[PDB]
Symmetry: C3
Subunit: 553 residues, 3 copies
């Protein structure tokens, strides 16, 4: 089967020289091409994108002078507050220091209504989880009007004390942080950094003037997003410094720069029971005067979380191939649309309701010509298929249903048009109850299938089709049938009953071709009893029943 391999199939097509259809086709093609190209370029769907891996190294620089009372102290954001310099860092903005605490008995701080109306109110032997002090069951006069429960704990106890207002280290808004960010795209084998040779050092970040300076003033960070540093400093907070890397690693469009943005990460309206702000407690234990003491510091501040995210794209051929394959089927849109137009306007419904109503749609009736040049309807050749023609009608009846002992003459079928004959070929030129022509005869077939041949040439009384001279010229012309037989077999022998059978079949074939036109219908046609029996009379059989119609398949 070598020839089976070497076959090539190509579809049969129909050019149409239509201005409208060609214009529509090209418009739709340009539209699809424009959109797919735009999507590819905008979304960079030709690039295989990779996420980055990041390293952050921060350096906070600030000295705050505090007058605590009176002692003038300096708070350097180099050793006092910054042992961690990386993704996240903390800048202290307030503190509550309790110097020289001794484990002894003292009143508890009156926080959130922590007081007593009577001595018996306090519970002996139970330590409050907030004050973290063991109650002795007595109530001390903490203040003149703010007496609180007696407790044995570190004293003077300050647990529950509110953060000082205004914040002690407000000057922290004047501090600066230098962020060094190293990224890599391991798949693309590309690494870069946010500081490059030839960058200003005295610069400070501004979203317009200095959008690439990695030195940030904290107050500016807060102002850029409408946050009040003075208020946030009191209880603390969490702020995000987002670094976005939208990086194009293609040589012809290379661009890998960071974009800095800011976002408050703590909730401003956190409920008082969910620990608003940001703080931590750390203690330093020291023995003074032979008595173990402890210095406790509750520090409030802003934790800055540096969030680095982004992707790096580089041209990938496989991605482009996949995208093109995905978008290729969209170029059949023109075909789909124009074929749908042809099919819709080829209907007989439009000439009856649409065009009469709208006369601007009349010239869209050429779709009927475009649809006959495009489609060839055919029917399933099932055994029950039969075609019927009546000389008193202009069209043909297809009886695909079975005859339940009912004469074929009395069967509705379904009307179909007679095919237009090839004019070029022709340019070279007592009776039964179901019979209206009077020339039909009872069928000799077995009673069960006798109704197939119970057909007449016409539906109303009149002259039989056999009376026409064309019937004799075509169907009963022994000369013409012999010529057709010789055309099929030039050396045919004109002797015996074989020739009489060959001529009878040719007469049937001739009537069916003459009155059904297409071979598709001529194959399943049914001859009337009149024509059938005239043919048989003029081409008899030596002996035996005529088989009648036999299923072609």
């Amino acid at each position: 089967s070598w020839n089976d391999v070497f076959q090539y199939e190509t579809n049969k097509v129909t050019r149409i020289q239509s201005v409208n259809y060609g214009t529509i086709k090209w418009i739709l093609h340009m539209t699809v091409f424009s959109y797919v190209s735009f999507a590819l370029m905008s979304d960079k769907l030709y690039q295989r994108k990779e996420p980055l891996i990041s390293s952050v190294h921060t350096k906070v620089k600030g000295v705050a002078e505090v007058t605590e009372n009176l002692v003038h102290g300096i708070f350097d954001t180099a050793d006092y507050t910054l042992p961690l310099q990386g993704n996240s860092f903390f800048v202290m903005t307030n503190y509550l220091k309790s110097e020289g605490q001794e484990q002894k008995l003292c009143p508890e701080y009156p926080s959130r209504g922590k007081q007593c109306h009577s001595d018996q109110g306090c519970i002996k032997g139970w330590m409050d989880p907030q004050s973290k002090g063991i109650q002795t069951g007595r109530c001390i006069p903490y203040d003149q009007k703010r007496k609180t429960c007696e407790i044995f704990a570190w004293c003077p106890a300050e647990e529950g004390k509110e953060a000082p207002r205004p914040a002690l280290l407000r000057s922290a808004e004047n501090f600066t942080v230098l962020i060094k960010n190293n990224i890599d795209f391991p798949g693309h084998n590309y690494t870069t950094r946010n500081i490059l040779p030839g960058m200003n050092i005295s610069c400070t970040f501004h979203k317009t003037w200095n959008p690439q300076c990695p030195i940030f003033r904290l107050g500016d960070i807060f102002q850029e997003i409408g946050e009040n540093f003075t208020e946030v400093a009191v209880q603390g907070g969490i702020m995000g410094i987002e670094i976005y890397w939208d990086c194009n690693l293609d040589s012809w469009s290379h661009r890998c720069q960071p974009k800095y943005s800011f976002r408050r990460l703590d909730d401003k309206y956190t409920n008082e029971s969910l620990f608003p702000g940001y703080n931590f407690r750390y203690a330093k234990y020291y023995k003074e005067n032979g008595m173990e003491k402890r210095t406790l510091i509750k520090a409030f501040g802003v934790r800055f979380d540096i969030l680095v995210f982004g992707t790096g794209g580089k041209f990938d051929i496989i991605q482009l191939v996949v995208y093109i394959g995905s978008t290729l089927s969209y170029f059949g849109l023109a075909t789909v649309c124009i074929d749908l137009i042809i099919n819709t306007y080829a209907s007989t419904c439009c000439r009856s309701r649409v065009y009469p109503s709208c006369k601007c749609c009349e010239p869209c009736a050429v779709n009927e010509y475009y649809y006959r040049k495009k489609c060839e309807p055919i029917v399933e050749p099932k055994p029950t298929l039969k075609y019927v023609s009546f000389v008193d009608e202009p069209h043909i009846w297809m009886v695909d249903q079975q005859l339940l002992g009912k004469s074929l003459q009395d069967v509705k079928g379904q009307e179909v048009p007679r095919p237009q004959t090839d004019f070029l070929e022709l340019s070279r030129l007592d009776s039964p109850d179901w019979c209206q022509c009077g020339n039909c005869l009872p069928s000799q077939l077995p009673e069960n299938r006798r109704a197939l041949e119970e057909l007449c040439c016409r539906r109303k009384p009149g002259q039989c089709i056999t009376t026409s001279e064309l019937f004799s010229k075509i169907v009963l012309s022994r000369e013409a049938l012999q010529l057709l037989l010789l055309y099929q077999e030039p050396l045919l022998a004109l002797e015996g009953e074989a020739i009489n059978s060959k001529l009878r079949h040719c007469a049937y074939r001739s009537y069916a071709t003459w009155r059904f036109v297409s071979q598709d219908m001529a194959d399943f046609a049914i001859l009337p009893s009149c024509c059938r029996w005239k043919i048989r009379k003029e081409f008899p059989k030596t002996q035996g029943q005529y088989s009648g119609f036999k299923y072609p398949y």
Copy 2:
């Protein structure tokens, strides 16, 4: 070439009114549509998904009362153990404290068999990397039966001492951690948090009852995954609190909630040489009695790593377009399947082996009618192409191969069927060694290509095709040929040898059309010597050799 632009191509098609094929087509279309729709909806392939950036802020709350001996102490997880409150946090569950250590000489702890069988066993001047103590070469009687090597180091040395069992801070399983998680999808410009207004505060996380409370009891964290906190507390561990954000940012299906899950991250069965658990050593140096001392604490505990991951989807038109384009080609499945059925059942092999064996497959022989209505086979018109017809055979022979001095009569070729003639058109109606008809003549062509015309009308002896009256009516009927010529050229001049050549060509064309049927074969047909020379005799040439068959292309 404006008309070239305005062309529209549409494929020629063939409707088939088949219940089976239409049903199959629609079933396959519904199947493909259902699957593509289901995939789109389930996988959300219309959504452009983005990973999140996260910030975590934790607050551990717990006081553990320890009776160390006797002194009753409190271990507050606010200052003693928690200066870091973010992605990861540590809860101490055990400790080994060595108070008031002095750099002097003392025995080494007997850990992992660290002992001596003799004084000379110990190495002088060498410091063990485990005990971290410089050996003096002597062995001290550390214990009555556990003497160990003498060392100069911090003393009393406790290096290698096992973690106390049961864990001192078992009460840490009753501690609670509040996790505040802020996420953002920077591309989608969406941010949310795990705590929202109107949430219960007294709640504690339960996977069913309170699946959204971000307050977790550590013992519950361990119980939920079948881990024993009491055992893990002895040597420590690492536990993961996974926060999954499967977030849909579309308005009509908006859902962005966290799902909390837990996973032990350290290996339970870590080898003793790979440092099982989690611990760290930290020292506090202080001068006591004028002698520099050091307090060493080895802390065992559980490090909790909060792992936040997830994606946020939002409708993207480009993604939907790409998905639809990818899935469009699957709607040709019905076409592929039904065309394959037609092709397979159109074979002549099925009527010979399949249908006789299986009679339920007989009604699938209409595929032969569907395949003749669908396909038009053609052959490459190469110069070696020739077609041959023998009046004693019912079919035709295509000789695509070359004649190597061998008469065309004696060439196998390959059998092809004679086309069915258009019955509608016809309804209007001494000898050489290779000659079996006796009426053929030697070819006058040059010897090299003389074998082309060495053909007879039949393969077996018999009457020549020329003897039929149809040959004279069609081929030798000067009247008919003149009528055909006039049809082609109405004003043709019937004079000179030009008319005699025009008639000879028409006679050849007529024989070829009559005996090959299709113009495709009639073009490459080969006339027998008998017919050829009868035609030439009745349409002679004034002078010169007859050219013979000439390649149409």
Copy 3:
């Protein structure tokens, strides 16, 4: 419309038994299949890939003996330097210690030219942001030739002092770090770790010998990437330990192993004003002799950032379906290419310029036969469409344009070939100024549209087509026209003016079919005045004007 549902469309095709085209088709199909398969397998486009979530637990092991002067001390990387063991860790490689500092007056260190040329140079009451010391306005003689400004600060002040060279803790290159890495793919529900049972413990990482040992010597880490640990130790740095997980979670191809790589993350050539290296300052405050003192340590070292990244793939049916759908349209490449070849080589331009120039391209002229068997050109049947035939020419003229009072005879039109007549069907066989035949008559139509019928049988003077006997046999043969009418309607009545109209129309139809061939052109043909008026004379009308050509649609 049940039959409307049960329709199946199949395209009409044309097999071609061509070795070249079949070979090209199969080559292109194999090429496309090979590439799509290769892309699928290489890129694993059948796998839905997921990023990992990671946990890292490190254990650094090293003791460095330092001789500070003389006191011999040990620096253990277990308690002195490592409280953090996770994603990032710090190994100290150098330090500057200032023991027993007292807040008093002293000279400032001469760093970066920090000196005075005169006492008045120093500013009173202003504290330098670098030295962090309040100036008293005087200049102390710090050194014999390096006098610096007087300042009140912690003393002896060492701010700005350069890091010692060579680094004190060079022995840190001999330290080892054990990295335990736990990953998970939450979607795939897969977790693994970098240490598995049966792994060597005494091993140390080597890229070839021990590529999976998670124990790393720091000096080896630096040597592997061409970094000098001795130099980096002086000022410090940041090094990355990248752990890549390319993990295949499919059972038949399961592989999930880590690949370790190293990358310096700090910039080697950082500007001196951008704080090169890595360091931090931490202080320990202690009261000595009743005077508050502070010990300051500036530590230089290398921060190691463990960067874990990777994806885990597992077979997904939806991904495979999407990929196949995307790549399906590429299998029409053979069709596109071969159809383009057929179209290009079917042009009449190739036979005139290409083949004469290049004779190796002659056998590609069969594409003209392949293109006539494949395409059926048609024209839009618009009202202005007209076809014209002149008996003195071999081809046909299509006049699609309007006649602006200009005789149709004098219209250029555009030449088209006359269709090849179905030879099988035929094998069964005083004057106006615009008239060249002399037998045409003035048109009786209204003057506005009178020019349509102003056509002659020929373009040059000569005999009229009507003079041919074929005109009388075909067009004026009342017998033949009656036979055609009877063929259409066998029981037609031959009486009245109706028959005379039926015959006149048939004569028009016969001329148009005889001289235009295709019904497409015969429909829009235009008869000459000579033939038209001869037909009308021999088939007159009782009374009334002849309507003339009427638009078929």
